[PDB]
Each structure stands twice: as structure tokens, then as C-alpha cells.
Amino acid sequence: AVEPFPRRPITRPHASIEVDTSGIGGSAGSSEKVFCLIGQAEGGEPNTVYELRNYSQAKRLFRSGELLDAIELAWGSNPNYTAGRILAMRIEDAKPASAEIGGLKITSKIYGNVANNIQVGLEKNTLSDSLRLRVIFQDDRFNEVYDNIGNIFTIKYKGEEANATFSVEHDEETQKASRLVLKVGDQEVKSYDLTGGAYDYTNAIITDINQLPDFEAKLSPFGDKNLESSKLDKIENANIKDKAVYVKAVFGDLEKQTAYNGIVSFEQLNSPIKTIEPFELTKLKGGTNGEPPATWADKLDKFAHEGGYYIVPLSSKQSVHAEVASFVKERSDAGEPMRAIVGGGFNESKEQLFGRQASLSNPRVSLVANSGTFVMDDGRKNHVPAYMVAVALGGLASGLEIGESITFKPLRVSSLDQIYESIDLDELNENGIISIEFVRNRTNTFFRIVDDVTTFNDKSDPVKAEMAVGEANDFLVSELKVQLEDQFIGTRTINTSASIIKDFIQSYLGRKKRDNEIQDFPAEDVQVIVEGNEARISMTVYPIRSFKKISVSLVYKQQTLQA
Amino acid sequence: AVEPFPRRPITRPHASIEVDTSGIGGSAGSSEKVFCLIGQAEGGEPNTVYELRNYSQAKRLFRSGELLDAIELAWGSNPNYTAGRILAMRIEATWADKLDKFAHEGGYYIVPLSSKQSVHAEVASFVKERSDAGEPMRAIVGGGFNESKEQLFGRQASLSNPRVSLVANSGTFVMDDGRKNHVPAYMVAVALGGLASGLEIGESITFKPLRVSSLDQIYESIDLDELNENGIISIEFVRNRTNTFFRIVDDVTTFNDKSDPVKAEMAVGEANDFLVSEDQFIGTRTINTSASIIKDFIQSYLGRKKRDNFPAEDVQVIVEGNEARISMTVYPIRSFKKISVSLVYKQQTLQA
Amino acid sequence: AVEPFPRRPITRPHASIEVDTSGIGGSAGSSEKVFCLIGQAEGGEPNTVYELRNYSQAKRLFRSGELLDAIELAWGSNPNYTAGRILAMRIEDAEPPATWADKLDKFAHEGGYYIVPLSSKQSVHAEVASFVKERSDAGEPMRAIVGGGFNESKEQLFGRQASLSNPRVSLVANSGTFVMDDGRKNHVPAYMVAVALGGLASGLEIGESITFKPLRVSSLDQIYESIDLDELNENGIISIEFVRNRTNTFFRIVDDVTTFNDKSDPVKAEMAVGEANDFLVSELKVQLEDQFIGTRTINTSASIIKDFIQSYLGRKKRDNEIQDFPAEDVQVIVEGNEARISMTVYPIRSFKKISVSLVYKQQTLQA
Amino acid sequence: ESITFKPLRVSSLDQIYESIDLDELNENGIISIEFVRNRTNTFFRIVDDVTTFN
């Protein structure tokens, strides 16, 4: 916008400035082909989608389940490309482990049966007049102790009068601290309202009370403790004259110090409220996975408006493949383009692959034929069903640039269960099924992805037959819609508007040409007509295409040499 | 209308502004061809017409029933076309009293989810009662799971009506849950009604594909001709290619007549239902006239106009009772059903 | 097609994209000839059609039988040309079959053009003749190649060519000895030579003749004299000539004359131009049908159909499947239900006569 | 100058209307606020400046 300085106008004689920032704002680059996986694993909150950037982060969320192996293959397969973000979700529902003891709810922050190995125990430190809390968990070699818990600050009375007592008033409605009262003799000397105003934090009371001559106050010796004064614990007539009485909050100190604890969260039982008391160490119970869900449809819905383009479900079940096919379809039609890549079981006959391809013909799904073995970063050599190979292909396709085909690219696989003859790869390709070719004619022998054909049979339209072209189309039309929306909708039809839109379109297509996301655009074909409430825009685009045939015609000719 | 500003009139000295807005009014275009369904469902409140806009909303209102499978087919046969609005009603016997509720819901094609011929006759009567009013409609219907040609002919003859079409074939659709759902032919009629609703105004379903997995019966060319000539729609299994697919043979209507396209062929009937139709000089300017000089005058006029911008053989004039009716012929857009190629082999002398 | 983005419409203020793919969508190339064989064999299930691509695949699906030799000759006899697909079917009753008409029908909607039956019986020849006629009339053009037994006189050959005078059958006179990749030399009936000729004809480009193409055989049992070959050529029987005057001796296929008795029309007499006609009509039919039927008769359709036909015929000219065409004879008339289309084609003919006129003349050299 | 597609600044909305819901209200001439979600940045648009007139 043009910005007025000052913002508030003036009607004296004055000067004013009007600054235009529109020349320097820039715009967003090409969208990330974020890659989506949905998988079983231990650990992590169910039905929650996690953005992931490092394998370390993944292995902290997910604990060695098949989802983590899939993430491993997804990043690790082709290291010469920049790593993308991953969106991961845990299929099964899983209860956290819990216990009830000592006036408290104890709850795990992890979910699943592992959480039943958590155990916690609470004891009196009779030296510091405090609690001491033990937390121990074996699967991570985790052990932490929190001590001097409960003491927050102290008051000493140093007047010459014999009688001086500390007291905190209940609020029976809420069980909060209503007021702080200091008594000397038969009267209050000073008192504070704790659940509102200037004294709603303990540190401010400590600051004020130290001004009074007879009283002095200090924080706990250990740590650094401050609380909303509402959480002060109920204390009556405590004889601050004889010794410096420690003021306490027990649950508040537990909450505050455990705030950064990643293993256990605590809540208090109720109204009457139970006194916090030490207890012999107890295990958590009842943490378990449920049965695997019969439908994934309502969970795949969670990826909606998570801005990621390729999905692989970690299952071989045709029902799951039809589910994800439908989800891809509905998100595409709603204007959030998607694709899915799919694979069979461990080793399934060529008839079964045609069966799947016929039962699931859709230009936004791809089926991977081969199954094989990978070598893991753990050093295992493991045997994996073909959908894990589809995970590897998805990681590659999300690593390649927009419209850069996975056709005829190396696959970092150790071996394949089926190695197909030339004619079998011909037939699988003709049926629109992706296969992996073992290249034996070279001295170095390696595995190539044969082609990026989609499961939609009709080769006639490249936007349907080929993944790369459909992807380039989807991103083209999506970035057109979103940018024309945010740039022009609601703007006034100024007499120049058609020229401005033409310049904007030519700028956009210039960028797409620069980045090798289109072959070219004939800029003379960009035409804009503005008529009343709308603009109609027309443009010609030559799409970018991978080579898939080369024909060489080689003609021998004689030559006469003389000297 | 022209708006006065101020709205109040004034007589003391003043200015007033009259605003002609009429140069800007719009939205005068057609309705879309909203699609209509009636049939069995769970969950929905019976005999209430619901607008539906996506399958999620359908599964939210209706559940666990053949109406939701119908809505699925209604958006699944035409994936490369706009998924428009659908109107649907759970019906919990006479059906007219229910069909009355659609009377002022602006939808053009209806399908009853039933094979019962009484239902089809009721629906044809409803379509008649609406279309003779200001709001045209059509219906599509189908048989059961397998009916003979003579049964189909008997049904078509009993249901012979220029706004009803019968579909013969039945088959299997792959649903989005992956179920191989075997369905009676009236669900194929739902699929065709969905396609016809998706197509443009006066496009035609002939030679469009049907995304169906298999058909219960495959008709050879003579049987396809028999059904077509009887005004029954049939589906061809295209076998002449490795890329086999299923093709809608024609958009014929159960009223078959060679003498009028508009009643024989559904798409031209729809065009007539949606087409749009588009200067005076008075005899006091002349002492006497006749149809001959009226014709020659209007020919000179339209000759001047077409020079600035009509064949004398194509304008008719009748004068009666101080009134002259001038009737032009006009040519609407049809769709090809026949291509005739005459191939002549010549031969040529080359020389060098 | 043209498609909206999004697919579901929006009412509130928005932008929407409409995208057209016709300019990049491909088109069907020139159709492929595929060769069909029906044979006595051991091996896979009878009365089903196998597509075969490799001799190894064939030698797994079939073994040790005349069908496998026929497949071998079909690929081996045309070394210069790309080895096409073969459609092969073992036949046995579920013992010798009385009739093959019950089984030939299983080829009907396969993508196959040339048939050879591996038998000498005239009844089988009539059956395949009827089948090829049936499928052609149905709109799936085919041809049959036919041959006799081990050794036959001209009388018997003329009798057979009487029994079948037909524009879609060709009779092969000669029988001979081949040499096989198994290191074997075997005398074979003339229909195995017909298998070789069908392999070559299906390998050759569309509209290219087998006349004067070489044939590869160890020997022929009947070496016909020049008058004998002229006699058989007049009777529309294909004969193999032993070239002897050249230093190199080899076997020519003399001519591609069909068994049809009237030579006045070459489209009926000669296999090559009949095949070119069949493919031209088939491709015109199927492409115009899927292109235009059901489309709106918009005012410009008279342009668009002419442009389509001119493009198609330009493509046919490019592949040398027609000689030429006049562009201005491509004419289209539109009436409310019907497109009426006119075209002229100059078809492509093989040279079968060359006449040289040589005029000796004097020149006066002087210096 | 129209308020359509101008931003609006609010901590939250109690009713988040779906796309079909917003189309319904826009057809009825009721102004509605759209929660933009597909962008990385999430913000509230004023959908349209339609008056209540039918």
C-alpha cells in the first residue's frame, strides 16, 4: 500500500510523506514437494501429523517402528539431492500409561505399551523439610531426581515482640490463596491480596515485605522458584518469630520444575482436594495400543491442508489403496493437488499386479511391481514388501525438481526378489506398472527405475499417462490460482488493469521458464480482456517433457581420397 | 427502473439526478442442469429434498444406503467434468405426492431409484405436468438386473414418452471403497443422468464412455441396432482395439419418430428447452401495400443490415386483418450422428 | 478435453483455471500387421490364443511340433526386418478335430491380419476363407495364405484354385527343404512355405509387395520352367523361381497374385494394394468415428473435418502408404444430422513392368 | 474500494465456516470471514462485500 506519514492527518500547514513499498516486496518461490507417510510405529501421539526435518527428531518421536524405517529409506535413498521435509502420522490408537497415587494423577507423555515401563516415586527429604521426587525409565536409560521441592520463599520476624505469626487465608470457593496475612500480637501489621493486583506474584511480595523493618524474606536456597501467588499453599499461624518459616507450594513447584520434563506430566485429584503425600514408587499401567483401525479414511483426512503432495500408505491392502485413491481424488478436486504411490506384498504374481492395476485405475495413483532388500543405517540387511520400494520411489520423486522425472534413475537397492526379462518389463510397462530393471550389460551392474507411468492405462494423454507432466500441470495451475487470487481479487478495475495483469502473467511465466518448469511461452499469445466485474485471461504454454525415445538414422557414404 | 435523486420530489429551485442503471444489469444467463434423485437411504429425514454439494456432505446426511451409492456413481462417471450440485430426497405405493416436492426445486434431470413400472409411469406423468408448465424437465429410467429384448420393448412401448429414456444394460461398478458392486440397470441410468447433467447445454451422451468394470450382457451389432431403433439406450463393448472400453451408443428416447428430431433425440430436445430467441414501420407512411412489397422492403432492409454487419427464399410473409407476420427460418446447432465418406481412387502419371 | 480447476465450482469471489491438452495429446501411429498361425502342436492348453515375442517363450509355451517350426520359419525368413508379434494357437479337441470353424472364431477380435492354417486339406482352406470373409465384412480386414501338400501337379493346383477363387486367399505352389536352427534339414509341405511367405509379408511395410523379394530355402522339390511359372502366374498361383543365370543362385518369390480369377481390378487381384486399401478404410473409419460422432455441429465443423482429413492424408503420404492426394478434392458438406465427405487418393503400386525403348543414333565426330 | 479480500485482524473466530458454508452465506448476501489455511501463513479474509439485498 501507499502509507501515509503521519497516519493521523493534520490540518495546519504541514508536510507529509507517502511511501510506496511495492517495488521491494518480492514473492514466494516454487512450492516444496513435501512427502507424506502414514505408518505403524511405537511412540508419538496417535492421529497427529508431525513435520520432521532430521532423522534424529523422527527417532525421538517414533521408536524403531516400520514408519521410522520408511522415513530412513525416504531420505537415504538418493543423497545427492537436498533433503525435503516429511509429514508422518501413527495409524493405531494408543492409550498413555497412567497411575493414581498420593493425591496425584501421574500420566506419561509417551503413548503405547512402552509407557507401562515408566515408574515414579516420591519421598520426604526430612533434612530440607521438602519433597524429593524420583523418576526412572529404563528404555531410554533415563533417571532424574528433583529435590528441595516445595519451598519457595521464607519470612523471618525480628521484632522484639513475643507474638508474631504467618497465616494464609483459604478461598473455599476455589481453594486458591485469597490473602496473605502477617500477624504481630493481637493484630495484623500488614496483609496482601494474592489473587489480583500488584501482589499477584510472589517475587513482588518478597520485594515489598523486605521494606518493612521487622520482616525479611528470601528465596529457597536451591534453584530459582517463582509462582503466581494464587498457588501459595495453605499455612496457618506459623511462628515466624522463632525461626524463618519456609512458605510452600507443593503442586505448584512440582508443575513448574517438571515443565521441561519430557517423560511425565502431573495433575492433582479433587470441592475437597487431596493433600499431597509421599508414596512408594509405582509403575504406570494401562498404556496400550488398540486394534489396528479397519478404516484409514478418517485419519488420511488429517493430511488435508497439510501442504504435501506425495503420499504412500504403508500397507499392501487393496482397500487401503482405494481409500488413499479416493482421498487423493477429493483433495485434488477441492483444489489441493495430490498423488499417491502404492505397492504390493512380498512377492506377488504378474496376474496379481494386473489385478491390482485393473481394480485401481486412476491417473493420480502409481503401483510398484518389484519387492527387494535394502541395507539399513543400522547395518541390518532387511527384506521388505514392495510398498517400501514405493516409499523409496516417493522419496526420490519428492527429491527431484518439479517435473524432473523418476524415469530411468538409479535405485539404491541391494537386490530384487524378481528380476524380469526384457519382455516382462515391456509387458509390465505396457500395463502401466512401474518396475525395476537390473542393468547387466554394463560392468558395473545396478538397478534402474524403468518408467514413471501411472496406473491409468490410456497413453493418449501425457498429463494422465506420465507422473512428471501431471505434477508440472498441478503446480502450474495451483500457483496460478493462488497468486492471481492474492494479487488481484478485490482490487479496483483501474483503466490500466488489463496491462498490469498482462505484465504480471508475463513475469510469472518468465520465472517458470527461468527455472526450467516450462519449455517456453509465446509472450504474444498472452491476452487479457477485462469486462465489468471480471477478467478473462488466455495464455499459451509449451510444457516441459522428458525424453522417452531416441531414434538415430545412420547413413554410410563412401569418400574418394587422392594425392 | 430509472431512479430519481432525491426520491422526494421538489419544486423550489434545485438540481435532480436521474440514474439509468439498466446498462449494467447481468446474471441473465441460464440455470445449470441440476440433477435430481429419489430413493432409499438411512439417516436422512424422509421426504425432504436436500441440496448436496460433495460426497462428504452426502455421507454426513445420508448413510448406509443405495442413495449414497447413487450419488457416488453420479459423480464417478464424469471425473473429467464439473461435479455440480445434486438434489436428493430419502423416500421412506404412490410416489406422485413426493415428486410434487421437486416441483419448485430447479433441477432438470430426475431418476427414480426403482425398476417398478408404476414408478416410471408416475415419474413420466410428473415430468409431463412440470414440462407443460414453465419449468421443463426430463427423466431417465432402467430395468432390473437382466431383462430380455422383448421385455425391454414391452416396457418401452408401455412407457413411450418423449421425455423418458430407458437404458437396457446392467453391470458392475468399482466403488471408491474398492467394492465390486453389482448394480441393476437403473443405477447405470443414474450414471448416464450424471454425465448428461455434467455435459454442456445441448451436448450429447452418444459416443461418450462409461467407466464401468463389466456388463451383464454384451449385445452384438444387430442387437444394438434393434435396441437403438426401438428408442432404447444400450452400451457397446468396444472390442476393435487392445484399449477396450464401454461406449454409450446413443441418446435415443422411448418416443421414436423419424419425422421430428426434437422428440427422438434427447440432446436436441434439451437444446429446444434451453435455446433463446431474438424494428417497425407503419402503413401510414404509405398509401397501399401488399405482402410482395412487404417482403421486398424487409429484404432490402436486411440486405443493408447484413452488408453493414438474408436469403429471399427463407423469409415468409403473411398479411391478415391489418397485421403482417414475417417469419424467418433459422438453423440450430445439431450433433453429428452419421459420417459418409466417398473415397475415389484416381491414378496419376509421374514423369521425370 | 478441457477441464476446470478446481473441479468443484466456487460461488464466492475466486480465480479458476481451465486447461486444454489437445495440443500435446498424442495420436495413433500406423497400425501394425500381426501374423496368425493355427497348428498341430504339443504344449500349452489348446483352443486359446498366445501372443508370442521370442522363440524361447514359444519353446516354453510349446514344444516339439510343427507350430513351433512354423513360428521359427516365420521369424527366421525375414532377417532384414523387425521381428513382429505372432499370435499362435494349438488345436486339439479336449484327437484330430473334424472342424476348425469352431476354433478360428477365437482369433476374431485379436489384432491379427494374416492367417495361415497348418494343414493341406481343402476343407480347412474353405473354412479359413469363410472366416476371413466374415471378419472382413464385420470390419476386421484379414487375409489367408494357403498351400498344398508335399508335391502337386499343375492339374491339382488349378483344381484347388478353382475350388477357391477369392480376393482374400493366396495359394502357394512350391514345397521345398528348409534348414533349421537345430541343425536339421527337413522336407516340408507347401503350406510351410506359405508360413514363410506370411512371415515376410507381415514383416514388410504396409503396401510393400513380396514380389521379387528373396526367399531362403535349402532346395525346392519342383523347379518350374519359365513357361511353367508363366502358366501358374496366369492362374493366380504364387510360384518360386530358381534364379540360375546369375553367378549367385537364389530363390525369388515370383509374384503376389491372389487366387482371384479377375485381374482387371488390382485392389482385388494383388495383395499389396488390397492391404493398403483395407488399412486406409479401417483407419479412416475408426478415427473419424472417435473424433467427430456426438460432437456439436458448430458452424466451423466444415473447416475442422477438412483439416483433419488433410492432416491424415499428409501423414499417409509421409509413410509412403499412398502415392499422393489432391488437397482441393478434400471437400466437406454439413447437413443437420450428417457430415458428407469427399476425397481423392492416388494409391501406391509396385512396379511389375518396365519397358525400355532404345534408339541407336549416329553422331559425326570431327576435329 | 471494496473490503472483499482485505485482511481482518482477530485472535480467533468461534465459527470456522467451510467452503460450502461460505458459499451458502455469500448466496444469501451475508458477509462471512474465511480462515485461510492452505497458505503457510494463516490469516482471516473478509470474503465479500455483498449487501443483505436479495
PDB file of N, CA and C in Angstrom, chain C residues 65-98:
ATOM      1  N   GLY C  65       6.952 -79.635 -32.196  1.00  0.00           N
ATOM      2  CA  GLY C  65       5.787 -79.743 -33.052  1.00  0.00           C
ATOM      3  C   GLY C  65       5.803 -78.705 -34.148  1.00  0.00           C
ATOM      4  N   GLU C  66       4.953 -78.943 -35.148  1.00  0.00           N
ATOM      5  CA  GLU C  66       5.006 -78.172 -36.385  1.00  0.00           C
ATOM      6  C   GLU C  66       4.661 -76.706 -36.167  1.00  0.00           C
ATOM      7  N   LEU C  67       3.846 -76.394 -35.159  1.00  0.00           N
ATOM      8  CA  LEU C  67       3.592 -74.997 -34.818  1.00  0.00           C
ATOM      9  C   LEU C  67       4.874 -74.264 -34.438  1.00  0.00           C
ATOM     10  N   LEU C  68       5.756 -74.921 -33.684  1.00  0.00           N
ATOM     11  CA  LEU C  68       6.994 -74.275 -33.262  1.00  0.00           C
ATOM     12  C   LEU C  68       7.963 -74.101 -34.426  1.00  0.00           C
ATOM     13  N   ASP C  69       8.003 -75.069 -35.341  1.00  0.00           N
ATOM     14  CA  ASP C  69       8.743 -74.880 -36.584  1.00  0.00           C
ATOM     15  C   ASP C  69       8.164 -73.741 -37.410  1.00  0.00           C
ATOM     16  N   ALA C  70       6.839 -73.647 -37.476  1.00  0.00           N
ATOM     17  CA  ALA C  70       6.207 -72.571 -38.231  1.00  0.00           C
ATOM     18  C   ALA C  70       6.548 -71.199 -37.661  1.00  0.00           C
ATOM     19  N   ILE C  71       6.505 -71.055 -36.335  1.00  0.00           N
ATOM     20  CA  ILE C  71       6.949 -69.820 -35.683  1.00  0.00           C
ATOM     21  C   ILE C  71       8.418 -69.526 -35.979  1.00  0.00           C
ATOM     22  N   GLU C  72       9.252 -70.569 -35.977  1.00  0.00           N
ATOM     23  CA  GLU C  72      10.662 -70.402 -36.316  1.00  0.00           C
ATOM     24  C   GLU C  72      10.837 -69.879 -37.735  1.00  0.00           C
ATOM     25  N   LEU C  73      10.184 -70.512 -38.706  1.00  0.00           N
ATOM     26  CA  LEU C  73      10.273 -70.040 -40.085  1.00  0.00           C
ATOM     27  C   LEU C  73       9.711 -68.629 -40.228  1.00  0.00           C
ATOM     28  N   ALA C  74       8.644 -68.318 -39.492  1.00  0.00           N
ATOM     29  CA  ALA C  74       8.020 -67.004 -39.601  1.00  0.00           C
ATOM     30  C   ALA C  74       8.958 -65.886 -39.163  1.00  0.00           C
ATOM     31  N   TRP C  75       9.681 -66.075 -38.056  1.00  0.00           N
ATOM     32  CA  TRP C  75      10.686 -65.075 -37.679  1.00  0.00           C
ATOM     33  C   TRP C  75      11.980 -65.163 -38.485  1.00  0.00           C
ATOM     34  N   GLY C  76      12.426 -66.363 -38.853  1.00  0.00           N
ATOM     35  CA  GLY C  76      13.736 -66.521 -39.463  1.00  0.00           C
ATOM     36  C   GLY C  76      13.836 -66.135 -40.923  1.00  0.00           C
ATOM     37  N   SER C  77      12.732 -66.150 -41.657  1.00  0.00           N
ATOM     38  CA  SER C  77      12.778 -65.982 -43.104  1.00  0.00           C
ATOM     39  C   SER C  77      12.822 -64.521 -43.544  1.00  0.00           C
ATOM     40  N   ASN C  78      12.869 -63.567 -42.612  1.00  0.00           N
ATOM     41  CA  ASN C  78      12.833 -62.135 -42.927  1.00  0.00           C
ATOM     42  C   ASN C  78      13.920 -61.354 -42.176  1.00  0.00           C
ATOM     43  N   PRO C  79      15.195 -61.749 -42.325  1.00  0.00           N
ATOM     44  CA  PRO C  79      16.224 -61.268 -41.384  1.00  0.00           C
ATOM     45  C   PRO C  79      16.403 -59.760 -41.379  1.00  0.00           C
ATOM     46  N   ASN C  80      16.139 -59.101 -42.506  1.00  0.00           N
ATOM     47  CA  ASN C  80      16.381 -57.672 -42.669  1.00  0.00           C
ATOM     48  C   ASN C  80      15.371 -56.794 -41.940  1.00  0.00           C
ATOM     49  N   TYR C  81      14.271 -57.354 -41.440  1.00  0.00           N
ATOM     50  CA  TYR C  81      13.132 -56.577 -40.977  1.00  0.00           C
ATOM     51  C   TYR C  81      12.842 -56.888 -39.514  1.00  0.00           C
ATOM     52  N   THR C  82      12.275 -55.898 -38.829  1.00  0.00           N
ATOM     53  CA  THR C  82      11.888 -56.048 -37.431  1.00  0.00           C
ATOM     54  C   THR C  82      10.944 -57.228 -37.232  1.00  0.00           C
ATOM     55  N   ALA C  83      11.264 -58.056 -36.239  1.00  0.00           N
ATOM     56  CA  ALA C  83      10.504 -59.264 -35.938  1.00  0.00           C
ATOM     57  C   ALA C  83       9.238 -58.878 -35.186  1.00  0.00           C
ATOM     58  N   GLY C  84       8.095 -59.017 -35.853  1.00  0.00           N
ATOM     59  CA  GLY C  84       6.822 -58.659 -35.270  1.00  0.00           C
ATOM     60  C   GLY C  84       6.286 -59.687 -34.289  1.00  0.00           C
ATOM     61  N   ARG C  85       5.191 -59.302 -33.642  1.00  0.00           N
ATOM     62  CA  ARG C  85       4.422 -60.216 -32.809  1.00  0.00           C
ATOM     63  C   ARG C  85       3.811 -61.332 -33.647  1.00  0.00           C
ATOM     64  N   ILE C  86       3.623 -62.491 -33.015  1.00  0.00           N
ATOM     65  CA  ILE C  86       2.900 -63.613 -33.603  1.00  0.00           C
ATOM     66  C   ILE C  86       1.810 -64.047 -32.633  1.00  0.00           C
ATOM     67  N   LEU C  87       0.633 -64.357 -33.173  1.00  0.00           N
ATOM     68  CA  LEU C  87      -0.472 -64.953 -32.430  1.00  0.00           C
ATOM     69  C   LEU C  87      -0.620 -66.410 -32.846  1.00  0.00           C
ATOM     70  N   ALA C  88      -0.461 -67.325 -31.895  1.00  0.00           N
ATOM     71  CA  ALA C  88      -0.416 -68.751 -32.184  1.00  0.00           C
ATOM     72  C   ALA C  88      -1.409 -69.475 -31.291  1.00  0.00           C
ATOM     73  N   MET C  89      -1.991 -70.550 -31.823  1.00  0.00           N
ATOM     74  CA  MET C  89      -2.946 -71.360 -31.076  1.00  0.00           C
ATOM     75  C   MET C  89      -2.750 -72.830 -31.412  1.00  0.00           C
ATOM     76  N   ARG C  90      -2.468 -73.629 -30.388  1.00  0.00           N
ATOM     77  CA  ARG C  90      -2.552 -75.077 -30.501  1.00  0.00           C
ATOM     78  C   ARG C  90      -4.013 -75.464 -30.684  1.00  0.00           C
ATOM     79  N   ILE C  91      -4.266 -76.491 -31.494  1.00  0.00           N
ATOM     80  CA  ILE C  91      -5.615 -77.023 -31.646  1.00  0.00           C
ATOM     81  C   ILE C  91      -5.615 -78.528 -31.420  1.00  0.00           C
ATOM     82  N   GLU C  92      -6.456 -78.963 -30.484  1.00  0.00           N
ATOM     83  CA  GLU C  92      -6.866 -80.346 -30.302  1.00  0.00           C
ATOM     84  C   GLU C  92      -8.241 -80.318 -29.657  1.00  0.00           C
ATOM     85  N   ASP C  93      -9.081 -81.285 -30.012  1.00  0.00           N
ATOM     86  CA  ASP C  93     -10.295 -81.498 -29.239  1.00  0.00           C
ATOM     87  C   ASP C  93      -9.949 -81.948 -27.825  1.00  0.00           C
ATOM     88  N   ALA C  94     -10.762 -81.511 -26.870  1.00  0.00           N
ATOM     89  CA  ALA C  94     -10.464 -81.711 -25.457  1.00  0.00           C
ATOM     90  C   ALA C  94     -10.617 -83.177 -25.075  1.00  0.00           C
ATOM     91  N   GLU C  95      -7.443 -85.675 -29.813  1.00  0.00           N
ATOM     92  CA  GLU C  95      -7.818 -86.335 -31.058  1.00  0.00           C
ATOM     93  C   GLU C  95      -7.974 -85.316 -32.192  1.00  0.00           C
ATOM     94  N   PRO C  96      -7.863 -85.757 -33.446  1.00  0.00           N
ATOM     95  CA  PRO C  96      -7.930 -84.815 -34.571  1.00  0.00           C
ATOM     96  C   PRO C  96      -9.271 -84.103 -34.614  1.00  0.00           C
ATOM     97  N   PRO C  97      -9.297 -82.786 -34.848  1.00  0.00           N
ATOM     98  CA  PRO C  97     -10.587 -82.100 -34.959  1.00  0.00           C
ATOM     99  C   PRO C  97     -11.234 -82.365 -36.308  1.00  0.00           C
ATOM    100  N   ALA C  98     -12.548 -82.588 -36.281  1.00  0.00           N
ATOM    101  CA  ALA C  98     -13.319 -82.637 -37.519  1.00  0.00           C
ATOM    102  C   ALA C  98     -13.371 -81.278 -38.207  1.00  0.00           C
TER     103      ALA C  98
END
